[PDB]
Structure 1
């Protein structure tokens, strides 16, 4: 399970200020902590988008060798950021809109980057796992067309808050399982984990419980809170239960430090 650390996002006030002030310290500090949590990737979200992404990339990769996950709907910004990246990167994201696909799929191929794909077009987030499924298939077909390796496509079936859209959660579990049972080579799957618990009580609880359930349906990656030690515990334990990682008594520690 790949944990993509969520915290370097402009929607958080300290990051918005750091970016505005062009003060790299809060950014670099969140970079170490997330990594130290056990994240093996860093989500980067400006919250001049192109320049801000650039600074985010440079400032962050100056203290961290983690895979950088460029999080923006401005494709200019991702591209600029893609250019600044010292190592392989992830793009977050494209959806199933052909206009996006023809741009971001090749874009990803140019830079040897991973690509996250939302099971949706511009119509809106689908109400069921069938409609989701059908968007994930286009994503897959898009990969083959543009020669993006299937293991480099991360499909996001889009989880929704448990309080207002409770009926979506099992529908998302179902799509994951359907994608899991795709023929070799199969694509990967990722979630925007924290959204499952948006305005709910005991968010960390909900977050980690869905993490475990989604991994059983083959979840490969999660944008999430890397400084939630209990979430990280879940991540490492789930790996063991799926016989993805060899047991030892210190499995938690091995995950955090591997």
Structure 2
């Protein structure tokens, strides 16, 4: 395939990518008449500055620019399709022509590519460029409306799907999502690409290149390089990296960081220096060539090029500089055995990571205080709840909006948009928890990073479970699987283990799911209810956790801790003590994370000795009177 052909080249030599097409377009000094080009004279809107319409009105100029770049030494050239979406063309009144413009640009690039390939004998590739558009999914258009968005996930998916269909019908060899200001836009583009690849089209290699705004080291949406890499890696890009808006000297640390975190190839095409007072770029071809040569001799990059300010002279110098340099060898494993999550910053859970606290208070179904805030429309206080949760030690936030009086997807969308507007909250990953899959989809379409989807199960059969898991995998998030099947909730050791094993083998064998993205919920259930049928639930969970951890490789264990102590409502001290004892024993058994009250978990050794003994008796069922003795202890505090 094309991926194998490109991979075989990337292990032998460093490739050179296109250059600055717009810079060469500006030197042509075209005007409105040239842009309109015999087909759009009577167009109702001005077309000057629309470089993408030049593939139909002035194809010769684009073709000669492509020829110049290919003869300079570029192995890959990008199509003139930076703004060739219906959304980006709406400003020019050409939103209906996106498919045709993409087809024409792909054809005009391909003609030059084949001509130069025949002339020189070196095969050259065409990359289909998908621009970031002027709309941001993760950033509000206006400051005073933080949860407001002027575009949705599905609209961007539709536009990107139309553009990519036009590019694939035109015959591009690579699909390149580049100049990514917003990672959510990149995820929408990847979603559209997956739709096209699963419906009709054979897959093509995908290149993903983000953009770092300045020395702060973050994208325009506020995400770091590692967080960006984690967020977009579910699309399995052949090459990843950064492009443009910075010079080589400033891009060196960030490109090095991105190189150390991914197993894919690293692509880097920065600006030709800084723009001067007049918008011109000062870096000469020799300085850019020596900077990228310093990049190559250090084993940092696999593909090089240039953004604005780059000319065929720059590309010629770069190609001659990196001709004999050894390509970067990607690491075989990047954080092996770790589960990767993201907010604005990466969150990784490894073998030596401590217990991960998932804040529980942002739960409409569970927390009545949070529900009362949500129904009244007071999302500002609901956001302060999450702020206090994170300030108190929560490493992941659980978000739930389940109620019969609420429309769940809209509330989830609003709350996720509001969370994304707060940097202190947006830096941690989110856990989308709901019994309705529509709310889960609404949450997944509103999150920039990589999240956790809580509690899909085999309750409604195998095919429904596989469909939901496939959708979750396409969105690229981790997910939790409850021990729930067609026979009901699993309440016993062997039933929990059987359901979890059956779910694990379905996801791995029949879906190719990443074992490090799989989390199991053996259903922590309430004890001390006064019913003998419920006396072994905690022991069952603790034993099943150990068996699952020692049997199913890569999987992790979670659960809702507060459900264990439901029979002792109002007795917060006893609930906290039982939570501490159960957490001690479960973490010793192999529990990795849980939805807990983050700041209210006592350490085992400073629990009161009498209360510790009572909680140990109740959890391990050492005393038939254990619940009665605990209630007597509660009563005798006055």
TM-score by length of 1: 0.84
Residue number among 38, 41, 51 corresponding to 2:410 in the alignment = 51
User: Within 5 Å, which residues of 2 pair with 1:110-129?
Assistant: 110-129=474-493
Larger Rg: 2
2:443 alignment counterpart: 81
**2:482–2:521: 8 Å Cα contact kept in structure 1?**
yes
**1:37–1:229: 8 Å Cα contact kept in structure 2?**
no
Give the whole-Å Cα distance in 2 for the aligned partners of 1:195 and 1:25: 28
Give the whole-Å Cα distance in 2 for the aligned partners of 1:221 and 1:129: 19
Shift of 1:186: 2.4
Q: Number of residues paired by the alignment?
A: 231
Structure 1 unaligned blocks of 5 or more: 235-258
Q: Does 1:220 align with 2:592?
A: yes
2:162 alignment counterpart: none
**2:466–2:507: 8 Å Cα contact kept in structure 1?**
no
Residue number among 367, 378, 381 corresponding to 1:23 in the alignment = 378
Shift of 1:108: 1.9
Give the whole-Å Cα distance in 1 for the aligned partners of 2:545 and 2:378: 40
Larger deviation: 89-98 or 9-18? Answer: 9-18
2:555 alignment counterpart: 187
Give the whole-Å Cα distance in 1 for the aligned partners of 2:580 and 2:464: 32
1:243 alignment counterpart: none
Higher relative contact order (CA 8 A, sep 6+): 1
**2:580–2:601: 8 Å Cα contact kept in structure 1?**
no
Q: Deviations over 1:128-162 (max 9, x none)?
A: 11111110012211221222211111101111112
Shift of 1:229: 5.0
Shift of 1:111: 1.8
Shift of 1:198: 0.6
2:41 alignment counterpart: none
Q: Does 1:41 align with 2:396?
A: yes
Give the whole-Å Cα distance in 2 for the aligned partners of 1:37 and 1:100: 38
1:157 alignment counterpart: 522
Shift of 1:61: 2.7
Shift of 1:122: 4.5
Residue number among 48, 61, 73 corresponding to 2:420 in the alignment = 61
**2:558–2:591: 8 Å Cα contact kept in structure 1?**
yes
Secondary structure of residue in 2 paired with 1:181: helix
**1:192–1:222: 8 Å Cα contact kept in structure 2?**
yes
Larger deviation: 167-176 or 56-65? Answer: 56-65
**1:93–1:117: 8 Å Cα contact kept in structure 2?**
yes
Larger deviation: 121-130 or 42-51? Answer: 121-130
Q: Which has the higher helix share?
A: 1
Give the whole-Å Cα distance in 1 for the aligned partners of 2:566 and 2:581: 14
TM-score by length of 2: 0.35
Give the whole-Å Cα distance in 2 for the aligned partners of 1:178 and 1:229: 25
1:245 alignment counterpart: none
**1:67–1:87: 8 Å Cα contact kept in structure 2?**
yes
2:581 alignment counterpart: 209
1:252 alignment counterpart: none
**2:401–2:411: 8 Å Cα contact kept in structure 1?**
yes
**1:5–1:224: 8 Å Cα contact kept in structure 2?**
yes
Give the whole-Å Cα distance in 2 for the aligned partners of 1:222 and 1:146: 26
Give the whole-Å Cα distance in 1 for the aligned partners of 2:495 and 2:601: 35
1:239 alignment counterpart: none
